[PDB]
Amino acid sequence: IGTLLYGANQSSKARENKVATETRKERMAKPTIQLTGADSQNPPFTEKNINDWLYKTVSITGRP
Amino acid sequence: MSLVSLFKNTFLKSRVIGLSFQAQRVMAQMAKTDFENPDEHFLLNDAMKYNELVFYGRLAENWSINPELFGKAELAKYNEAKQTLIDFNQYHALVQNLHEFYWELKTIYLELSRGVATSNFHNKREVTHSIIESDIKNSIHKYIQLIDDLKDYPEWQHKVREEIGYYAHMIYTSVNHDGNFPEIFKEFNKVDSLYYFK
Amino acid sequence: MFKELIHIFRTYFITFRYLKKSNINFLKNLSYTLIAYYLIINFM
Amino acid sequence: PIRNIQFARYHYLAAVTVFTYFATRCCLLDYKKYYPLASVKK
Amino acid sequence: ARLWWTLDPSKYYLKQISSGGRNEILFTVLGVTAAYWYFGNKRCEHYWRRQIDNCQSWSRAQNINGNNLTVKQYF
Amino acid sequence: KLDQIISYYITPVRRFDKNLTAEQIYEQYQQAAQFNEIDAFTNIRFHRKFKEYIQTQEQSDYLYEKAKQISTLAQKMFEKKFP
Amino acid sequence: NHSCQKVFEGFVSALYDTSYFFRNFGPFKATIHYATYANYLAQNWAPRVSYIETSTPAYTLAKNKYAVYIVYGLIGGALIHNYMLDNKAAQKSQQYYLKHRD
Amino acid sequence: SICLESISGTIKGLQKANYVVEHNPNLTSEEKKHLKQFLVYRYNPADPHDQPKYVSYWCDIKKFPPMFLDAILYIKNELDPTLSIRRSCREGICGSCAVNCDGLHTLACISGFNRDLSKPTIITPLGHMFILKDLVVDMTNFYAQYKMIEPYLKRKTPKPDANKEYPQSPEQRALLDGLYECVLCAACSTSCPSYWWHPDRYLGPAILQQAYRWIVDSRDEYTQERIERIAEDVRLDDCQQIGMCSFTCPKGLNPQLSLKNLMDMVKDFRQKRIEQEVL
Amino acid sequence: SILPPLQYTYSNEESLELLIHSIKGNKDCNSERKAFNLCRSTVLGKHVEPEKCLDKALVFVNCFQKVRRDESAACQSAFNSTLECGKKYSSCQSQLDAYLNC
Amino acid sequence: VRLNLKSNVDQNEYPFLAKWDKDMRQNYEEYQNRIDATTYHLQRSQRGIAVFGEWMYPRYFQKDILELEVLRRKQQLGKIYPEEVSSYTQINPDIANDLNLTFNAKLLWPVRGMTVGAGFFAFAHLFNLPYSFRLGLFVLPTAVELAFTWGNKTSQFKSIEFMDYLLQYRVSKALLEKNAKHFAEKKAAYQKEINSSQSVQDLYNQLITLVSEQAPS
Amino acid sequence: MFSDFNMYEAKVFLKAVADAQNTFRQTAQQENQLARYESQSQSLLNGSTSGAISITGDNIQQGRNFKALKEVKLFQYSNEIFKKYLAGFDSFSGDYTAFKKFLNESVKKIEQDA
Ligand code: SF4
Ligand code: F3S
Ligand code: FES
């Protein structure tokens, strides 16, 4: 019974992963957002707004 | 390690033996109570280990114990207690069947009574219909057979004749001696009719 | 209250005698549970 | 020898009074019937 | 008879468990703990609420079919 | 209890200053709802940033009035830059 | 009645048989039995405060002579503590939203 | 099938018969009335063509003694012999002639009908009991309830004398005095409202008084068992202390007081079963 | 959870000041307020064309602001006394009546 | 507050607005009187002492706060037309049923209970039961339907939502007729050069996000 | 506390004050909604005319002249003004008072450069 429940849970996680990766593909199919100048110095990504920027392609300037 | 088994066995033995001690009292009280609501005085006056007795009797007859925990005397006492609980279950089934037959007779009587009350402007019929007569005949036959089956137990026979037969007498008093009355009450007018001054 | 209410029902209404005291005591339990539930929720 | 007989009496009386209060709303009237027979201010 | 109204409790329920009095302290502790949990969350919801109008609180209305809700002037 | 009821009635009333006139109050309400074409792109960023600094209607009103002032200035500059 | 009496008998026999099957079908019988005993325990062994103390006062537990006052103290303390917590939460909310108002 | 016609007939029945609420056929055709009018109930459930049929007899009061039973016997011997009634003792000691003597359940023989010739006097069966014939109800349900109470002396223990009498004394004899004089006439039971509604589960004032008499019998040692037998369901509890069981006793007994004391003993019996059984 | 949430957080001083100023306005600006409520009762003025009610609303708000200013020295003194009484209150009817007569 | 019944709307240029104003003013007196009665009840209940009011207020007087809210909202919308109801069936079906359950539009005869009782009457006429039982088993389902029909206060909240929606719709539709003359010239060009039934408020937000994602910036 | 008559005077007066503020709000919002709808309609018609956006039913697609859209110019200018003046925007983790001070400083700078 435990293994059957674990299999059902992993199947549900696989469904959730497919939904998540399709959402990520939809997010990433958008053109890159340029961040140069002050837009680089103060990136819009923050813990408050992370869900509004997840899997969005940016071209950010900075020093590694 | 075997805490679950130990607790289950001690709970079952404790309840079974405790209700085995207080079982003959309950059976005797149920004998005193009329067949109509044999469980009364337990719903009203004292539920002196009646519902607990029924529940744990069914459990004891439908559970199993581990004889490893029991001693010799403990196991003998538990088995005697289980036998007493099974006998109580059989006794309760018997009194419940008798009570249900009593309520069959009382339903016949109430059907007759509702047709004679002054409030019954709904339906006043001078003559009882055919199916009620057939029910009366069949129920009287069953009552006679029940009395015959209790021939080995004079006290039970007397109790059944007193309680269940009383409503047969009431049905007798509610009907004139016309039509098929001699045939319907032919089995009744042999012995139990004279028991009720007829 | 419930005892005398049931007695009034049984005395005057013939058809209430069809109910054996086993059913009446079940109505007693249901009524007590309903009253307790009502009193509890009216303060919630 | 009932224990807390006074408490039992008080509890029964309180339960009856509370039930009759909430089931009948006797103390919480509606005065829309009395509104026409009233003199307004302002 | 004709005198049945008494505040005295019925002796049918006045019985007592074999291991002490009726289980009341345990059940009143359980009730108090339940009351603390229940009247601890409604208090949290009541006092920590504010109403805000921003033009960002509004979102497009949609039908049960999911499409946007637009009603014509003349239907 | 009437004190609590009148507190509930007090709350929907915004706190405008004593020395303000009604005309100035109406002007300040005009500026809050002032349409600038530049808002359509600035409002997205403004709402995204203010969504975490808003707990009270006072904060909401102040931040949105400031954002509308910025939008008005930006619209003036844009219309002076793109005739 | 008439020929419909056979239909009446069939219908009543069907109802009786369905009731009998539902009552004493093993799982349903077991769960009805357990429900009946649970109902008995709930109704007859409710947490009362008044009960017959047949035992002599030298035998009654102090837990039974003080259970009334323990229950009353617990309930009253819970009520007054809820009132105090409501007042404290009100003042805390007011102070917090005055601090964050600015 | 037989339903709708029955409903229509009965609803049309009483409504068309509530107007004619007393049929009052006359035995003969009379012109000059120097005689008291007797409306005697008549019903013979032996021929299909018969219904409750109040019959107005006219007869001189002087010719028979001023007793209801004597008047009925005058009616049922000379005018209409078809009338039936139970009567044996002629002294108010057997209880056979209990009928509804002008709106009251009293023994016919020890009773005096009103002397006013203008006002008719009505004689009816005992009331809430099935009617076997004119004024002859069947008290068999009453008699049967007398069998349940075990109305015979029951001794738990014997006496050492074995050749003498049970010691009862004059004082303890008076306890059952005023309880043993009942003639089982069943006039209080048929006029006791608690018995009207529950003839089955309520023993009745007379039967409960006999049970009380056997309970307070000094020699009887089955007091607790008799109390248990009568203190079951509504055998006794149905009595409402109305007091009409005592107002209509021709022998002057007090069934109301007997049942009040019985209920007091029962109420004490329930309490005594806890105080006297705790170890 | 059923009582309406608060929009603007008012301190005790602000709430009492608004109370007293509203009472003064209703005893003084009654006519303008009634006219404004008259304009703001019909469907037009309340929902469709609030532009019409602009002048009456401005008149009412100007009168209320004049009340809130209470430039009179006696009005200021009496209002401060009533505010002190209210804040001590955490009665006052005599102080209020003394203030409103000014 | 004593609004005169005659409306000042043109009735020839804004027919919908004139009809709405006429309906609002026609029923204003009845709803105003009921609102006054409810407010007086609330005030007097607040005036009570201890458990008679001022303690159980407004927590236990919730059946008349709802009545006051419904009365005010319905006072704003003088009469609700069946054409405008069907639109809200897009959001919530059975809204007509809720409005019937809350607004005394008609007499809610218990059709379901009556037909169930007739079904019992058919069975009681086959294996004949007394007509007393027939009457009882006819009253019982009708009584059940009446109990489940009246007292439904969730229908009142559904009607509050519907009335808010309909108020907003009527306010917007009133602005449409006022500015229909002004936008007639622009409407022709917009319709002829932009073939789309999507709203301008909806199309423009698509343009905003499209420029936000893919623009030379 | 005060008399219930005075409390209800306060109630009705505060209802009137709230209604007046709602009237101000309604007038401003209605006139600016008219202006906003006119501007949005004009923008859409201009964009469709100059071949900058192609509208097919519900979804609009970028065209050839999309680089000349007034909306595109507005977006570029908004990004530029945010970069030059609102430097700390979208990442300011300070408290509300510091955020107000930063916004005030940015507004003053824009007023200087207006
Ligand atoms: S107690 Fe009196 S009225 Fe009753 S049966 Fe005996 S003699 Fe007759
Ligand atoms: S009227 Fe009958 S009810 Fe009791 S006192 Fe008399 S015996
Ligand atoms: S004839 Fe004996 S009692 Fe009358």
Cα B31 from Cα G6, distance rounded (Å): 39
The encoded tokens of residue J22 equal 């006429």
Q: Which residues line ligand 3 (CB under 6 A)?
A: H 69, 87-90, 92-97, 107-109
Q: E5 to chain C: nearest residue by CA?
A: C1
DSSP class of H76: I
Q: Which of J17, J16, J72, J62 is nearest to J42 (CA)?
A: J62
Query: What DSSP string describes A1-57?
Result: -HHHHHHHHHHHHHHHHHHHHHHHHHHHTSPPEEE-THHHHS-S--TTTGGGTTT--
Report the alpha-carbon distance of residue F71 to residue F61 in Å, rounded.
15
Instruction: Sort K85 into a burial class: Cβ within 10 Å, 0-12 / 13-18 / 19+.
Output: buried
Among the listed residues K18, K109, K24, K97, the one whose alpha carbon sits nearest the alpha carbon of residue F28: K24
Structure determined via: cryo-EM
Cα(E60)–Cα(E58) distance, rounded to whole angstroms?
7
Q: Which residues of H are known binding-site members?
A: 88-90, 93-97, 109, 182, 185, 188, 192, 215, 217, 220, 223, 239-245, 249
What span, in angstroms and rounded, lies between the C-alpha atoms of A22 and B30? Answer: 73
User: Residue-wise over J88-102: b if at least 16 C-beta within 10 A, else e?
Assistant: bebeeeebbebbbbb
Q: Is the dihedral of CA I46, I52, I58, I59 positive or negative?
A: negative
Which residues, listed in sequence order, are joined to residue H123 by a DSSP beta bridge? Answer: H40, H101
Instruction: Say if residues I80 and I16 touch (Cβ distance below 8 Å).
Output: no
Q: Which of G45, G48, G54, G75 to mutate to test the interface with E (most CBs of E within 10 A)?
A: G48
Q: Does ligand 2 come within 6 angstroms of the Cβ of H89?
A: no
Amino acid at I50: P
Helix, strand or coil for residue H99?
A: strand
Taking CA atoms, what residue in A is nearest to K76? A34
Closest CA to G73 of C40, E24, E39: E24
| β-sheet bridge partners, residue H57 | H38
Look at strands A33-35 and A58-60 and give their pairing.
parallel
Best residue for ligand 3 mutational test, from H68, H90, H101, H123 (most atoms within 8 Å of Cβ): H90
CB distance G39–C32 less than 8 Å? no
For residue K17, give every residue at least 6 positions away whose Cβ sits within 8 Å of its Cβ, in sequence order, or none.
Answer: F13, I22, I61, I64
Angle in degrees, 0-180, between the axes of helices F2-10 and I12-28, rounded to the nearest 10: 90
User: Alpha-carbon dihedral of residues J163, J167, J169, J170, nearest 10 degrees?
Assistant: 130
Q: State the nearest Cα–Cα gap between J5 and chain H, in angstroms.
A: 57
Tell which residue, J75, J78, J71, J74, has the closest CA to residue J22: J78
Judge contact between A55 and A27, C-beta under 8 A: yes
Provide the token pair at C19. 């109910």
Q: Are B95 and B28 spatial neighbours (Cβ–Cβ below 8 Å)?
A: no
Query: What is the token pair recorded at K30?
Result: 């209605």
Cβ contacts of H119-122, under 8 Å, gap ≥ 24: H120/H36, H120/H37, H120/H38, H120/H39, H120/H56, H121/H36, H121/H37, H121/H38, H121/H39, H122/H38, H122/H39, H122/H40, H122/H41, H122/H54
Query: Which of F3, F6, F35, F41 to mutate: most J Cβ within 10 Å?
Result: F41
Closest CA to H235 of J17, J127, B166: B166
Give one DSSP letter per residue of F48-75, joined into a string.
Answer: HHHTTS-SSHHHHHHHHHHHHHHHHHHH
C9 three-class SS: helix
Residue indicated by tokens 């209800």: K8
Out of H194, H249, H264, give the residue to mutate to test ligand 2, the one with the largest number of ligand atoms within 8 Å of its CB.
H194
SS3 sequence of chain B: CCHHHHHHHHHHHHHHHHHHHCCHHHHHHHHHCCCCCCCCCCCCCCCCCCHHHHHHHHHHHHCCCCCCCCCHHHHHHHHHHHHHHHHHHHHHHHHHHHHHHHHHHHHHHHHHHHCCCCCCCCCCCCCCCHHHHHHHHHHHHHHHHHHHHHHHCHHHHHHHHHHHHHHHHHHHHCCCCCCCHHHHCCCCCCCHHHHCCC
**What does the DSSP 8-state code read for residue I4?**
P
